Ligand SMILES: C=C(C[C@H]1O[B-](O)(O)c2cc(OC3CNC3)ccc21)C(=O)O
């Protein structure tokens with residue numbers, strides 16, 4: 001049964017196992033008078049743990065490393081940040097403090113620094129053009145073009161057909177868009193096209209916020225975006 005925002009006090013972290021060596025991490029934060037849940041990904045790489053995205057905060061993130069060790073017992077050696085907002089790079093300093101080599105594209109690094117956000121240590125090359133992909137450990141990394149933001153990346157685990165969309169992918173119950181001051185709404189469904197074509201087998205699909213689903217979510221997300229747009 002997946003955790004929900006109301007089960008997670010602010011500053012605490014949960015883990016949810018999706019498939020052998022594949023988990024999502026969940027945390028909750030305040031963003032103007034309300035508290036929201038946020039998702040991330042953890043994939044086993046043998047003796048070591050690959051992190052996708054922070055827990056939204058230097059504090060939540062210290063609590064993410066705690067629950068990983070308690071519940072998994074392995075060491076996080078590399079983390080990838082899917083885009084440049086604070087639910088994705090916030091916590092990257094704690095991470096580096098505690099031993100992690102932290103990676104994100106050069107677009108992400110440059111945008112985080114202009115914004116006033118924390119900055120990943122190492123550049124990810126091979127993701128500068130729509131449809132580019134690169135292997136990185138036990139996952140694949142995919143830049144499908146502009147959408148939620150100009151630099152957003154998704155992450156596929158072939159060993160288990162888990163597809164992680166980040167904030168470019170909405171959950172089923174979300175019926176309005178909300179936050180888009182950095183989206184490319186026009187380009188966004190063309191970018192979901194590329195994801196659908198590129199991973200049409202995916203059994204599991206994880207959104208930046210909320211409840212997991214399947215490829216249904218790609219259609220569901222395409223629809224919400226074209227509604228915002230027609231109004
Ligand atoms: C739930 C959300 C908001 C969530 O999406 B996001 O672009 O990853 C993000 C950034 C963010 O940064 C703050 C720190 N200063 C502005 C805060 C919240 C979000 C949604 O549905 O989109």
Ligand SMILES: [Zn+2]
Nearest residue numbers: 083085149167
């Ligand atoms: Zn964002």
Ligand SMILES: [Zn+2]
Nearest residue numbers: 087167208209
């Ligand atoms: Zn988000």
